[PDB]
Amino acid sequence: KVFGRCELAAAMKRHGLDNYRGYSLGNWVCAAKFESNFNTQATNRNTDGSTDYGILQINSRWWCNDGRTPGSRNLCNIPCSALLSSDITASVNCAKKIVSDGNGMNAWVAWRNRCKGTDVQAWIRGCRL
């Protein structure tokens, strides 16, 4: 499923992402845009044998189990396929753990390169939250 910008913003605010760990909703919507382009089925293969899954591109080496990544940890304790669903619940719950793992939102490379230090409130413009 491909979310609309405000549609995703509403879903995220309901799951408690707004200002979570001091990161405004705009940061989360911006991260999702550049990580997966709002597509819940997005999967990207990394050259190290791991794969990023879903709307927030969560990694299979440390966060979810996909059964084919050497040295997997599965810290979110869920199969990576569950991060490819239409409802973002699983992805959000796992993202909450990742963000408080000592690196803030720097964990998401696309956020760091395209969202960090910018006017992120622009990502929630026109949305009725």
- Where along the chain do its domains lie? 1-129
**Residue whose pair of structure tokens reads 């992805």 in the numeric block:** 91
Task: Compute how many other C-beta atoms are within 10 angstroms of the C-beta atom of residue 82.
Answer: 16
Question: Resolution of this entry in Å?
Answer: 1.6
> Which tokens is 13 given?
């605010």
Q: Is 101 annotated as a binding residue?
A: yes
Residues 6+ apart with CB under 8 A from 63: 73, 74, 75, 76, 94, 97, 98
User: Which experimental technique did the depositors report for determining this structure?
Assistant: X-ray
Q: Which sequence positions are flagged as catalytic?
A: 35, 52
User: Does residue 66 sit in helix, strand or coil?
Assistant: coil
**In this structure, which topology does domain 1-129 adopt according to CATH?**
Lysozyme (1.10.530)
Q: 24: which 2 tokens?
A: 């405004």
What whole-number distance in Å separates Cα of residue 9 and Cα of residue 129? 8
What residue spans of the chain are helical by DSSP H? 5-14, 25-36, 89-99, 109-114
Q: Measured between alpha carbons, how far is 91 from 69 in angstroms, rounded to an integer?
A: 19
Return the ∠ at Cα 42 (arms to 61 and 34), rounded to 5°: 95
